[PDB]
Amino acid sequence: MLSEVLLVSAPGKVILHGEHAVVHGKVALAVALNLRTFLVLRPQSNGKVSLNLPNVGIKQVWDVATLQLLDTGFQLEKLKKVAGLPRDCVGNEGLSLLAFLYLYLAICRKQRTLPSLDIMVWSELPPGAGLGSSAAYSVCVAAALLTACEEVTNPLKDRGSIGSWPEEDLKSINKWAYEGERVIHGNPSGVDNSVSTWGGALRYQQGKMSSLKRLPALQILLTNTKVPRSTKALVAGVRSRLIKFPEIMAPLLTSIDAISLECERVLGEMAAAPVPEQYLVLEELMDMNQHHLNALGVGHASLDQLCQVTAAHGLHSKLTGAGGGGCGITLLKPGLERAKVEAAKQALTGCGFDCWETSIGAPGVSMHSATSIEDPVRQALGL
Amino acid sequence: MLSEVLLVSAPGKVILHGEHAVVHGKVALAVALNLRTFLVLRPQSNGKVSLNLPNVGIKQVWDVATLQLLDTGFQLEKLKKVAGLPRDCVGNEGLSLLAFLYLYLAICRKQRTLPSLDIMVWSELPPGAGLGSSAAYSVCVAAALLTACEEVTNPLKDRGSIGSWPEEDLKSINKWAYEGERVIHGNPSGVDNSVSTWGGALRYQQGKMSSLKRLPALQILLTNTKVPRSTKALVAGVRSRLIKFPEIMAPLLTSIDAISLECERVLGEMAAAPVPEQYLVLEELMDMNQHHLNALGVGHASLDQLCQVTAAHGLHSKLTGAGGGGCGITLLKPGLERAKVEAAKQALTGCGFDCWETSIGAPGVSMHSATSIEDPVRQALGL
Ligand SMILES: [Mg+2]
Ligand SMILES: [Mg+2]
């Protein structure tokens, strides 16, 4: 067990290419989004484990005593049924406390005595926009507990600035993160928590994942049209259009599959020396994938709008994820012109959108010294 | 020879589907556009053949005497070299008088004596927008002369209202029309003059043409962004993008090919009983072909604009032809709402565009009684 205060953070995810085509067996590329989730673990002298989620403004508290006398025994792992009474509240983020409490017991079981902790979670990630926030959250929770119970090595065992876990350690964090995702999503594929853990880019096709080895630095603009949407609804639509127009749609999905592939190849060639001409290839891949998604019928007025304003300032974009609203990605290559992107952000904001100037192909589960944290995150977490 | 005054008209053409994909062997559908070209032939007592083109404000005049003593002898048919001196002016529409004079001699040769005529040509077709105006013009010229020299039957031999030539007659008109197209375009495929002659819809793939047998009534909105463009330039671009991204582009062109095919099939099923749901299939085929053309890189701001305003009023559209400017097609199905299309036209006009509410799948070479002509065309032709 550790006595030190832990501060870990995991990034979000966004589909660069391959969004709807993955359901039909094509390749897709997911990448770490640098809108991180932060978690602060503070050991407690008292005997109560307390979880705090400022955003969803909720902070439940349990006492080691009670939990201590839990008949822990580690279709569907019914253990959840038990855990349901073992605690007491419910709601949207209700499964979040249920995922925690499950990570807590399951992980701190091997501990002679349940430790008294204090967790503070705050993310820059917009909830519900399909940016994988609950994976980043689970990854952050599994990382903090594992390190606390020293089930995994401690990246800041050198008092360094920022640190990460070694491969065999990361594999474990990701294994537990998947559990938490299972209690909250029941049937997650493992891409979200995988992206959140390893960071970078991830190839995904038919259950098979791979981390693109080399990946360049990508600056984008994340835009949330805040337009609600049904994921289930869009996928069904594509499924339909596919049944309705088989010979038109089959080749189209093959075309998207080729975009993800091409992109993957180009990215690997940029990881070497980022020639300016290679950014031109990506912008084109983004324009094309965006048109193909429109052909798939998953576009939206808010999205053609984001793209129209963006091209109005010379930037390229595409929706990311489900489409029909949600978020969009805008590439920002080297050799900008502040005024251009700056005019874009207000233009984008004028439409009633939320716009962030973040990056893609981000790090992954990271441990930070509470001294190398931004003031916003600082005041928020309580540092 | 006839002494009566002749009034023939031929429609223009527009690619419903298949625009750039035809170069790469895919199927394409061309259809008669109801923006007609009118030609008025008046026999003359004097001895001078005079051609008048109000639009291009030019009206040359030759005298039978001179032409009479022409050593007529009927790589490249050098006969044109001769015909060049046999007459005297030159310019843009300079080959037009050269095509005429070539149709005139070549067709009226068998005439014991060159007849003295007076031709008046005026079209509702915008020149240079790729709507095949010179084919319609050639078709009109071949029709009028053939009928005059009675080399072909006379549709108004019954003093009827509107008439057309029988198949074997049309085939001839089209054969001569192709000659005139050859002198003006040197290497025409025969689609333009074919569409202008038979009217309706035309299937075209790899030199092989076919007339779709049954075809429904289609109401559209023709919009000319008046944005200049290089046809040679766009095709090369596609050729390039195709070389650059072979696996992405091949399937895309296969996808467009499937759209033209599907459409052809649907049209044939509408020729029966036009169920409202079938117009929904076309709008979708139009949305998809429009996105694919954007993927091909032949789109333009003026075109995304035409489509944006159009969808803003619930209508569907796609560029037609070269893209990168030029004209766009907007489908207008049964069960409109005047205000909708009406708001669209001004909206479209507001953008500085020329908008027509015409139709597609039009008639073809037709002979009209100078009494069943619109006043605009009336005052214009001099009737
Ligand atoms: Mg998630
Ligand atoms: Mg023509």
Tab-separated table of N, CA, C and O in Angstrom, chain A residues 93-168:
chain	number	residue	atom	x	y	z
A	93	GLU	N	-24.864	8.374	-13.759
A	93	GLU	CA	-23.483	8.126	-13.341
A	93	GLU	C	-23.504	7.160	-12.135
A	93	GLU	O	-22.501	6.963	-11.432
A	94	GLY	N	-24.677	6.576	-11.906
A	94	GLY	CA	-24.876	5.620	-10.833
A	94	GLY	C	-24.036	4.374	-11.008
A	94	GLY	O	-23.563	3.806	-10.021
A	95	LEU	N	-23.849	3.940	-12.251
A	95	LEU	CA	-23.017	2.761	-12.524
A	95	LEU	C	-21.523	3.094	-12.350
A	95	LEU	O	-20.690	2.203	-12.189
A	96	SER	N	-21.202	4.386	-12.405
A	96	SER	CA	-19.834	4.862	-12.267
A	96	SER	C	-19.329	4.506	-10.852
A	96	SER	O	-18.219	3.987	-10.707
A	97	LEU	N	-20.161	4.757	-9.825
A	97	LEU	CA	-19.845	4.469	-8.412
A	97	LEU	C	-19.885	2.966	-8.233
A	97	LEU	O	-19.265	2.397	-7.353
A	98	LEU	N	-20.639	2.318	-9.091
A	98	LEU	CA	-20.761	0.896	-9.007
A	98	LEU	C	-19.541	0.266	-9.661
A	98	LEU	O	-19.069	-0.797	-9.255
A	99	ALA	N	-19.004	0.934	-10.672
A	99	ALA	CA	-17.788	0.433	-11.329
A	99	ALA	C	-16.630	0.633	-10.336
A	99	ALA	O	-15.827	-0.257	-10.130
A	100	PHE	N	-16.587	1.808	-9.710
A	100	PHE	CA	-15.549	2.147	-8.732
A	100	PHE	C	-15.524	1.120	-7.625
A	100	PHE	O	-14.594	0.325	-7.515
A	101	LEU	N	-16.572	1.165	-6.809
A	101	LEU	CA	-16.760	0.247	-5.696
A	101	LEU	C	-16.372	-1.168	-6.109
A	101	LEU	O	-15.769	-1.864	-5.305
A	102	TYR	N	-16.684	-1.587	-7.350
A	102	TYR	CA	-16.280	-2.928	-7.869
A	102	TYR	C	-14.766	-3.014	-8.091
A	102	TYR	O	-14.190	-4.136	-8.036
A	103	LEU	N	-14.127	-1.864	-8.342
A	103	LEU	CA	-12.668	-1.863	-8.610
A	103	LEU	C	-11.711	-1.811	-7.421
A	103	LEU	O	-10.853	-2.681	-7.311
A	104	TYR	N	-12.594	-1.090	-6.531
A	104	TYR	CA	-12.054	-0.935	-5.182
A	104	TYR	C	-11.984	-2.248	-4.425
A	104	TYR	O	-10.926	-2.621	-3.927
A	105	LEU	N	-13.109	-2.944	-4.324
A	105	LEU	CA	-13.130	-4.219	-3.615
A	105	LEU	C	-12.270	-5.226	-4.350
A	105	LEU	O	-11.322	-5.769	-3.793
A	106	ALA	N	-12.611	-5.468	-5.609
A	106	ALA	CA	-11.891	-6.426	-6.427
A	106	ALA	C	-10.374	-6.222	-6.412
A	106	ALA	O	-9.621	-7.194	-6.406
A	107	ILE	N	-9.925	-4.971	-6.391
A	107	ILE	CA	-8.489	-4.702	-6.399
A	107	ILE	C	-7.840	-4.654	-5.014
A	107	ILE	O	-6.724	-5.147	-4.837
A	108	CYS	N	-8.527	-4.063	-4.040
A	108	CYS	CA	-8.000	-3.953	-2.684
A	108	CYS	C	-8.357	-5.154	-1.825
A	108	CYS	O	-8.170	-5.124	-0.612
A	109	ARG	N	-8.878	-6.205	-2.451
A	109	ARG	CA	-9.263	-7.393	-1.708
A	109	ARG	C	-8.017	-7.966	-1.046
A	109	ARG	O	-7.979	-8.162	0.170
A	110	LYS	N	-6.995	-8.202	-1.862
A	110	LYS	CA	-5.725	-8.761	-1.405
A	110	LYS	C	-5.093	-7.926	-0.294
A	110	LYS	O	-4.063	-8.298	0.267
A	111	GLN	N	-5.713	-6.796	0.022
A	111	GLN	CA	-5.210	-5.920	1.074
A	111	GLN	C	-5.754	-6.406	2.418
A	111	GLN	O	-6.965	-6.545	2.596
A	112	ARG	N	-4.846	-6.664	3.351
A	112	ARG	CA	-5.215	-7.141	4.681
A	112	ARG	C	-6.398	-6.367	5.260
A	112	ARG	O	-7.210	-6.921	5.998
A	113	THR	N	-6.501	-5.090	4.908
A	113	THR	CA	-7.590	-4.255	5.397
A	113	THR	C	-7.931	-3.178	4.382
A	113	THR	O	-7.047	-2.455	3.919
A	114	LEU	N	-9.211	-3.070	4.038
A	114	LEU	CA	-9.641	-2.066	3.079
A	114	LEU	C	-9.061	-0.718	3.476
A	114	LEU	O	-9.239	-0.260	4.603
A	115	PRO	N	-8.345	-0.068	2.552
A	115	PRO	CA	-7.761	1.235	2.868
A	115	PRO	C	-8.799	2.340	2.794
A	115	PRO	O	-9.774	2.242	2.052
A	116	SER	N	-8.597	3.387	3.582
A	116	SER	CA	-9.507	4.519	3.583
A	116	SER	C	-8.926	5.524	2.599
A	116	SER	O	-7.839	6.050	2.809
A	117	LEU	N	-9.657	5.791	1.524
A	117	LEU	CA	-9.178	6.702	0.490
A	117	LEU	C	-10.103	7.885	0.222
A	117	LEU	O	-11.168	8.016	0.818
A	118	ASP	N	-9.669	8.735	-0.699
A	118	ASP	CA	-10.422	9.905	-1.117
A	118	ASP	C	-10.061	10.167	-2.579
A	118	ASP	O	-8.934	10.555	-2.885
A	119	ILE	N	-11.019	9.935	-3.474
A	119	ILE	CA	-10.801	10.132	-4.907
A	119	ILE	C	-11.532	11.343	-5.453
A	119	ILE	O	-12.703	11.567	-5.157
A	120	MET	N	-10.826	12.113	-6.269
A	120	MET	CA	-11.377	13.309	-6.895
A	120	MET	C	-11.192	13.191	-8.406
A	120	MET	O	-10.064	13.208	-8.897
A	121	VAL	N	-12.295	13.067	-9.140
A	121	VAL	CA	-12.224	12.952	-10.594
A	121	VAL	C	-12.809	14.171	-11.306
A	121	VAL	O	-13.915	14.619	-11.013
A	122	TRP	N	-12.037	14.702	-12.243
A	122	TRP	CA	-12.434	15.859	-13.030
A	122	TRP	C	-11.822	15.730	-14.428
A	122	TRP	O	-10.613	15.552	-14.560
A	123	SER	N	-12.648	15.825	-15.468
A	123	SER	CA	-12.135	15.713	-16.832
A	123	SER	C	-12.451	16.900	-17.723
A	123	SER	O	-13.442	17.596	-17.523
A	124	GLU	N	-11.582	17.118	-18.707
A	124	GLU	CA	-11.750	18.196	-19.673
A	124	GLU	C	-12.618	17.638	-20.781
A	124	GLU	O	-12.976	18.344	-21.719
A	125	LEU	N	-12.946	16.357	-20.665
A	125	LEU	CA	-13.748	15.684	-21.667
A	125	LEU	C	-15.208	15.983	-21.530
A	125	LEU	O	-15.751	15.951	-20.438
A	126	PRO	N	-15.860	16.302	-22.655
A	126	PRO	CA	-17.290	16.598	-22.673
A	126	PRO	C	-17.991	15.261	-22.530
A	126	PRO	O	-17.648	14.288	-23.207
A	127	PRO	N	-18.962	15.168	-21.626
A	127	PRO	CA	-19.617	13.865	-21.510
A	127	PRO	C	-20.666	13.637	-22.603
A	127	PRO	O	-21.250	14.585	-23.130
A	128	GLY	N	-20.871	12.370	-22.951
A	128	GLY	CA	-21.861	12.012	-23.956
A	128	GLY	C	-21.591	12.325	-25.418
A	128	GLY	O	-22.466	12.097	-26.260
A	129	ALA	N	-20.405	12.835	-25.740
A	129	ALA	CA	-20.095	13.158	-27.130
A	129	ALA	C	-19.369	12.011	-27.831
A	129	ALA	O	-18.849	12.180	-28.940
A	130	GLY	N	-19.336	10.849	-27.182
A	130	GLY	CA	-18.676	9.686	-27.755
A	130	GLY	C	-17.156	9.765	-27.774
A	130	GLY	O	-16.492	9.077	-28.563
A	131	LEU	N	-16.596	10.611	-26.909
A	131	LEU	CA	-15.153	10.772	-26.829
A	131	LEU	C	-14.530	9.789	-25.834
A	131	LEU	O	-13.393	9.970	-25.395
A	132	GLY	N	-15.295	8.751	-25.484
A	132	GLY	CA	-14.833	7.716	-24.570
A	132	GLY	C	-14.523	8.089	-23.126
A	132	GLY	O	-13.718	7.426	-22.471
A	133	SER	N	-15.190	9.114	-22.606
A	133	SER	CA	-14.940	9.582	-21.257
A	133	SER	C	-14.998	8.552	-20.135
A	133	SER	O	-14.228	8.658	-19.177
A	134	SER	N	-15.887	7.568	-20.229
A	134	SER	CA	-15.981	6.566	-19.167
A	134	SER	C	-14.833	5.562	-19.192
A	134	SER	O	-14.570	4.882	-18.203
A	135	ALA	N	-14.157	5.449	-20.327
A	135	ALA	CA	-13.028	4.542	-20.421
A	135	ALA	C	-11.889	5.259	-19.718
A	135	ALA	O	-11.225	4.689	-18.860
A	136	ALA	N	-11.676	6.517	-20.093
A	136	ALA	CA	-10.626	7.331	-19.496
A	136	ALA	C	-10.826	7.340	-17.982
A	136	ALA	O	-9.871	7.283	-17.201
A	137	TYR	N	-12.084	7.407	-17.572
A	137	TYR	CA	-12.415	7.402	-16.157
A	137	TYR	C	-12.034	6.068	-15.500
A	137	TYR	O	-11.442	6.046	-14.421
A	138	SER	N	-12.392	4.967	-16.154
A	138	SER	CA	-12.095	3.637	-15.642
A	138	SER	C	-10.600	3.404	-15.632
A	138	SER	O	-10.061	2.843	-14.685
A	139	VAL	N	-9.930	3.813	-16.700
A	139	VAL	CA	-8.491	3.662	-16.785
A	139	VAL	C	-7.854	4.419	-15.625
A	139	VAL	O	-6.964	3.899	-14.962
A	140	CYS	N	-8.320	5.643	-15.377
A	140	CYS	CA	-7.793	6.444	-14.281
A	140	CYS	C	-8.029	5.779	-12.936
A	140	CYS	O	-7.178	5.846	-12.053
A	141	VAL	N	-9.189	5.150	-12.772
A	141	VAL	CA	-9.499	4.505	-11.503
A	141	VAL	C	-8.668	3.246	-11.290
A	141	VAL	O	-8.191	3.008	-10.191
A	142	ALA	N	-8.496	2.445	-12.337
A	142	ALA	CA	-7.720	1.220	-12.220
A	142	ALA	C	-6.254	1.558	-11.992
A	142	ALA	O	-5.559	0.891	-11.229
A	143	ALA	N	-5.781	2.604	-12.651
A	143	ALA	CA	-4.391	3.004	-12.501
A	143	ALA	C	-4.091	3.417	-11.072
A	143	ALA	O	-3.125	2.932	-10.483
A	144	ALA	N	-4.928	4.293	-10.514
A	144	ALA	CA	-4.723	4.815	-9.164
A	144	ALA	C	-4.772	3.756	-8.070
A	144	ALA	O	-3.938	3.754	-7.163
A	145	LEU	N	-5.742	2.854	-8.155
A	145	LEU	CA	-5.867	1.803	-7.157
A	145	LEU	C	-4.711	0.811	-7.264
A	145	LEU	O	-4.066	0.505	-6.264
A	146	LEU	N	-4.444	0.319	-8.470
A	146	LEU	CA	-3.351	-0.628	-8.689
A	146	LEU	C	-2.056	-0.089	-8.107
A	146	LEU	O	-1.380	-0.770	-7.351
A	147	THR	N	-1.718	1.140	-8.466
A	147	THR	CA	-0.504	1.773	-7.975
A	147	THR	C	-0.561	1.919	-6.453
A	147	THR	O	0.434	1.695	-5.757
A	148	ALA	N	-1.723	2.295	-5.934
A	148	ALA	CA	-1.874	2.471	-4.495
A	148	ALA	C	-1.592	1.164	-3.765
A	148	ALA	O	-0.785	1.125	-2.837
A	149	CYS	N	-2.262	0.099	-4.187
A	149	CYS	CA	-2.082	-1.209	-3.572
A	149	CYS	C	-0.796	-1.850	-4.068
A	149	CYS	O	-0.538	-3.032	-3.819
A	150	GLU	N	-0.003	-1.049	-4.775
A	150	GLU	CA	1.270	-1.475	-5.338
A	150	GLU	C	1.190	-2.770	-6.117
A	150	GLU	O	2.137	-3.558	-6.116
A	151	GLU	N	0.050	-3.001	-6.759
A	151	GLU	CA	-0.152	-4.188	-7.582
A	151	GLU	C	0.564	-3.915	-8.896
A	151	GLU	O	0.774	-4.805	-9.720
A	152	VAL	N	0.941	-2.657	-9.065
A	152	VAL	CA	1.616	-2.198	-10.260
A	152	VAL	C	2.713	-1.238	-9.783
A	152	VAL	O	2.608	-0.668	-8.689
A	153	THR	N	3.767	-1.082	-10.584
A	153	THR	CA	4.887	-0.218	-10.223
A	153	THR	C	4.450	1.238	-10.165
A	153	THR	O	3.414	1.599	-10.706
A	154	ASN	N	5.252	2.068	-9.505
A	154	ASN	CA	4.952	3.488	-9.346
A	154	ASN	C	5.824	4.359	-10.260
A	154	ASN	O	7.028	4.508	-10.032
A	155	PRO	N	5.226	4.943	-11.316
A	155	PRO	CA	5.971	5.795	-12.251
A	155	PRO	C	6.742	6.953	-11.602
A	155	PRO	O	7.783	7.362	-12.104
A	156	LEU	N	6.242	7.487	-10.496
A	156	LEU	CA	6.950	8.570	-9.822
A	156	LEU	C	7.709	8.042	-8.607
A	156	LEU	O	7.578	8.563	-7.498
A	157	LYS	N	8.490	6.990	-8.824
A	157	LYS	CA	9.292	6.397	-7.763
A	157	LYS	C	10.634	7.134	-7.805
A	157	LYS	O	11.545	6.870	-7.015
A	158	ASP	N	10.730	8.076	-8.739
A	158	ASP	CA	11.932	8.875	-8.939
A	158	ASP	C	11.635	10.357	-8.713
A	158	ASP	O	12.454	11.214	-9.045
A	159	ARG	N	10.460	10.652	-8.165
A	159	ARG	CA	10.049	12.030	-7.907
A	159	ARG	C	10.070	12.861	-9.184
A	159	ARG	O	10.072	14.091	-9.133
A	160	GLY	N	10.073	12.176	-10.325
A	160	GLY	CA	10.094	12.853	-11.609
A	160	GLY	C	8.930	13.804	-11.815
A	160	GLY	O	8.152	14.062	-10.892
A	161	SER	N	8.809	14.327	-13.030
A	161	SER	CA	7.739	15.258	-13.357
A	161	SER	C	6.495	14.499	-13.803
A	161	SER	O	5.458	14.522	-13.136
A	162	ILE	N	6.607	13.831	-14.944
A	162	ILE	CA	5.510	13.046	-15.491
A	162	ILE	C	6.041	11.639	-15.751
A	162	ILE	O	7.195	11.467	-16.146
A	163	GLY	N	5.205	10.631	-15.521
A	163	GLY	CA	5.652	9.267	-15.733
A	163	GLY	C	4.594	8.321	-16.257
A	163	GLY	O	3.406	8.631	-16.255
A	164	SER	N	5.041	7.154	-16.707
A	164	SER	CA	4.144	6.143	-17.235
A	164	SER	C	4.556	4.748	-16.789
A	164	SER	O	5.688	4.514	-16.377
A	165	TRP	N	3.618	3.821	-16.884
A	165	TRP	CA	3.872	2.456	-16.485
A	165	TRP	C	4.472	1.656	-17.621
A	165	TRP	O	4.269	1.979	-18.799
A	166	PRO	N	5.237	0.611	-17.280
A	166	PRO	CA	5.874	-0.264	-18.264
A	166	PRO	C	4.803	-1.171	-18.883
A	166	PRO	O	3.769	-1.422	-18.265
A	167	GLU	N	5.064	-1.646	-20.098
A	167	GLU	CA	4.135	-2.494	-20.842
A	167	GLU	C	3.358	-3.546	-20.052
A	167	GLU	O	2.135	-3.607	-20.155
A	168	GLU	N	4.038	-4.387	-19.276
A	168	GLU	CA	3.316	-5.413	-18.513
A	168	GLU	C	2.406	-4.790	-17.457
A	168	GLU	O	1.412	-5.388	-17.047
